[PDB]
Design a protein around this motif. Structure first.
Motif, short mmCIF file in Angstrom:
data_model
loop_
_atom_site.label_atom_id
_atom_site.label_comp_id
_atom_site.label_asym_id
_atom_site.label_seq_id
_atom_site.Cartn_x
_atom_site.Cartn_y
_atom_site.Cartn_z
N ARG B 109 43.46 42.57 51.22
CA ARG B 109 43.07 41.24 50.76
C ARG B 109 42.94 41.27 49.24
N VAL B 110 43.65 40.37 48.57
CA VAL B 110 43.63 40.28 47.11
C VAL B 110 43.41 38.83 46.71
N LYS B 111 42.89 38.66 45.50
CA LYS B 111 42.66 37.34 44.92
C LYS B 111 43.49 37.21 43.65
N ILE B 112 44.26 36.14 43.56
CA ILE B 112 45.19 35.93 42.45
C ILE B 112 44.47 35.16 41.35
N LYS B 113 44.47 35.72 40.15
CA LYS B 113 43.84 35.10 38.99
C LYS B 113 44.85 35.01 37.86
N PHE B 114 44.49 34.25 36.82
CA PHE B 114 45.37 33.94 35.70
C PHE B 114 44.71 34.30 34.38
N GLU B 115 44.18 35.52 34.30
CA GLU B 115 43.55 35.99 33.07
C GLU B 115 44.54 35.98 31.91
N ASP B 116 44.06 35.51 30.75
CA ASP B 116 44.80 35.45 29.49
C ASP B 116 46.25 34.99 29.66
N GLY B 117 46.48 34.00 30.52
CA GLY B 117 47.79 33.42 30.67
C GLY B 117 48.78 34.23 31.46
N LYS B 118 48.34 35.30 32.12
CA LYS B 118 49.21 36.13 32.95
C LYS B 118 48.62 36.25 34.34
N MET B 119 49.48 36.15 35.35
CA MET B 119 49.03 36.26 36.73
C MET B 119 48.60 37.69 37.03
N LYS B 120 47.46 37.82 37.72
CA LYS B 120 46.92 39.12 38.08
C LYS B 120 46.26 39.01 39.44
N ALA B 121 46.03 40.17 40.06
CA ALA B 121 45.40 40.24 41.36
C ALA B 121 44.28 41.27 41.33
N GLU B 122 43.27 41.04 42.16
CA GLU B 122 42.16 41.98 42.32
C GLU B 122 41.85 42.13 43.80
N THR B 123 41.53 43.36 44.21
CA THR B 123 41.33 43.65 45.62
C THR B 123 40.03 43.04 46.12
N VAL B 124 40.11 42.31 47.23
CA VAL B 124 38.93 41.74 47.87
C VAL B 124 38.44 42.64 49.00
N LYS B 125 39.34 43.03 49.90
CA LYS B 125 39.01 43.94 51.00
C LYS B 125 40.08 45.02 51.06
#
Lengths: 90, 374, 114, 43, 64
Positions: B109-125
């Motif tokens: 499980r990952v969450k998609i974010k848009f830090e500093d104008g670039k798409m990124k993901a971080e692990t949720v589970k």
């Protein structure tokens, strides 16, 4: 003729009779192929080349001349042909 | 305890999934995958003998005549059962595998974010493969196993990091050997210093280490060795063999390896695919000359799982030949077996599908090498 | 006149960013692949079959890691093949699957999680 | 042209002074024989 | 032993070990021509392994 052609080769094409230090096998090939394809070797140089094919015979001959093997190896790298006249730097 | 000595492979069980990913400058058609086999016989240097999950090493080790056990966790869904069945049909011990009924196998499980104008993901589970706890370990397996094998993929998970270190303590208590097969995943190629800090503890906890040539040069200095490879004398070569413009098989000196050496290291192997096997021990060092031929079968060749076969062959010979660590000639003779195992593994599509048996590996070793090298 | 042989479209990091930012009605499946990777051929064929299965009910795209290496590293890609199942609802969280997972696994994920 | 082959493993024993050195059509040193030479193989 | 196993056809060496001699010392590659010298390094042959067959397996079994 084969006196002006050689001079032309030397002058215009850089030819020079540099010494070719050959192994006993190459020396035997050059000295023995001058006689024929499969013939009993008769020229003494060919007989000597045949005898030198075995390094044991070469070592025995070197011991017979009473010299060491190192400068005999260095003896091969001797300049053949005539020597130029000595320089008189006046 | 039955023979041959048992080995334990710790980590995630996955189907295929080569971890080592870098940038290659020779891409094929983005859609026509029928052209992508040309990159199997002209591979990127980092992908010459790719490794994989520890389950690949376990399966290859069992196929080479050894006994292996896998330590890890899978979900209670269909995919986890299928993975466990695949490991079971290969006669790999499953008693060290822990099931999680509430987890989805190989799913994160990952969450998609848009830090500093670039798409990124971080692990949720985290997936169940990265969620094995120290309380879920199998103590009988860790007691019986004579070699403990793991990859640096577990260092990308904190839970698996803690579990790995607890398992290493347990294995060292019972007398087992620690085999660190690096297999750097995509994140661990970002920069040298962060990877060195991340792997320092596991590196110092290992008795046997296998790295690729690219991995070792990245860990020491990439630019220096790239410059050394590209050097060409201006006027004349220093010896005749340098006039042939042959492929570079540079053997690193133990002085260059000194930063990565420690006291408990019994054997370090650097693999340039199957072509070269540079080995380093506290007493001696050298290289085993190998070969490869994937052009013999251009339509079935696939390099996936070749490094797994090499590592499995190394473990197979180590468990049955203790004199490898002390005799250089014996070490080279036994490493030729791993070279042959890696060579055969390149001839089939699929890592698990193409793992050689001991008979075929010995046959190829005797065919390739002259009888005095056996 | 001639149908195209491949239904999975290759997108850049910026194009995928715009696709994810924009409104989505169907699930979006993102594939990370490299042509030098042996397992990616089988995944390519499997995803072509999946795209044939889900005509307009899903979106299948692929990103080459040899052109978007930094983008792949940012998205927590640890190896290949790697799939990202992105739900049309922004509230939900995407699923990353690693390895040559079966086609039925992709169908189950799309049906019961997206 | 028929080839004489060694019938046993052993040591070849013959006198090289009754044969004449030559060079085969293959470029090898050899001995030409014109007499009833006797060769001993110490098996 | 010998001279009775040979007469009876019982398994025995073809050459009597007692009536056996070595082959002395031969050329040591320093008193040999180039074409009769043992190569410095062993050469790969593709014939370096003995061919397997039924006879070898059966003979090994009956020797066991």
């Amino acid at each position: 003729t084969e006196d002006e052609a050689r001079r032309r080769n030397w002058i215009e094409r850089g030819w020079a009779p540099w010494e070719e230090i050959l192994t006993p096998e190459a020396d035997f090939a050059r000295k023995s192929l001058n006689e024929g394809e499969e013939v009993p070797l008769q020229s003494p140089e060919a007989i000597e080349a045949f005898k030198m094919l075995r390094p044991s015979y070469r070592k025995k001959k070197i011991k017979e001349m009473g010299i060491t093997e190192d400068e005999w190896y260095a003896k091969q790298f001797e300049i053949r042909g005539d020597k130029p006249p000595p320089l008189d730097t006046s | 305890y039955d023979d041959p000595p048992l080995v334990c492979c710790f980590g995630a069980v996955q189907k295929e999934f080569v971890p080592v990913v870098r940038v290659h400058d020779n891409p094929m058609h983005p859609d026509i995958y029928s052209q992508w086999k040309m990159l199997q016989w002209d591979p990127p240097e980092f992908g010459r003998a790719p490794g994989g999950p520890p389950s690949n090493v376990a399966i290859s080790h069992v196929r080479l005549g050894g006994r292996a056990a896998f330590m890890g966790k899978v979900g209670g869904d269909d995919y986890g059962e299928e993975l466990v069945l695949m490991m079971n049909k290969e006669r790999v011990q499953t008693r060290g595998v822990k099931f999680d009924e509430g987890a989805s196998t190989a799913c994160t499980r990952v969450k998609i974010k848009f830090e500093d104008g670039k798409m990124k993901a971080e692990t949720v589970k985290e997936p169940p493969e990265d969620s094995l706890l120290a309380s879920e370990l199998n103590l009988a397996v860790l007691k019986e196993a004579r070699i403990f094998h793991f990859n640096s993929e577990v260092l990308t998970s904190p839970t698996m990091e803690s579990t790995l270190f607890k398992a290493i303590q347990w294995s060292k208590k019972f007398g087992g050997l620690i085999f660190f097969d690096l297999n750097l995943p995509l994140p661990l190629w970002r920069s040298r210093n962060e990877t060195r800090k991340l792997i320092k503890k596991s590196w110092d906890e290992a008795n046997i280490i296998e790295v690729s040539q690219q991995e070792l040069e990245f860990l020491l200095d990439e630019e220096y060795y790239e410059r050394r490879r590209n050097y060409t004398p201006q006027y004349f070569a220093e010896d005749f063999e340098q006039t042939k413009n042959r492929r570079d098989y540079y053997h690193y000196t133990p002085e260059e390896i000194k930063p990565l050496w420690h006291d408990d290291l019994k054997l370090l192997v650097v693999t340039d695919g199957t072509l070269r096997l540079h080995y380093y021990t506290p007493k001696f060092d050298g290289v085993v000359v190998g070969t490869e031929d994937v052009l013999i079968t251009p339509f079935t060749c696939d390099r996936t799982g070749s490094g797994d076969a090499v590592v499995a062959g190394i473990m197979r010979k180590l468990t049955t030949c203790p004199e490898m660590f002390e005799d250089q000639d014996v070490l080279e003779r036994q490493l030729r077996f791993a070279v042959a195992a890696g060579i055969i593994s390149q001839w089939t599509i699929g890592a698990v599908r193409g793992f050689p048996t001991e008979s075929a590996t010995q046959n190829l070793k005797e065919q390739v090498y002259v009888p005095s090298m056996w | 006149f001639v149908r195209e042989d491949y239904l999975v479209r290759k997108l850049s990091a910026q194009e995928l960013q715009d696709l994810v930012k924009g409104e989505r009605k169907v699930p979006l499946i993102v594939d990370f692949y490299a042509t030098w990777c042996g397992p990616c051929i089988l995944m390519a064929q499997e995803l072509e079959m999946l795209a044939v299965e889900y005509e307009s009910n899903a979106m299948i795209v692929k990103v080459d890691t040899d052109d978007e290496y930094e983008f792949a590293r940012d998205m927590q890609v640890r190896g290949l093949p790697t799939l990202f199942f992105i739900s049309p609802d922004p509230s939900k969280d995407a699923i990353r699957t690693e390895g040559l997972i079966p086609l039925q696994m992709m169908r189950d994920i799309i049906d019961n999680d997206m | 042209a028929e080839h004489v082959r060694a019938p046993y493993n052993g040591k070849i024993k013959f006198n090289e002074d009754l044969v004449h050195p030559t060079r085969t059509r293959h470029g090898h040193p050899a001995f030409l024989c014109y007499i009833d030479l006797s060769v001993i193989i110490e098996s | 032993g010998f001279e009775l196993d040979k007469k009876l056809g019982r398994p025995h060496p073809f050459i009597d070990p007692t009536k056996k001699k070595q082959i002395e010392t031969t050329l040591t590659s320093d008193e040999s021509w180039w074409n009769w010298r043992k190569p410095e390094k062993e050469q790969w042959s593709r014939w370096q392994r003995r061919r397997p067959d039924v006879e070898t397996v059966f003979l090994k079994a009956m020797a066991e």
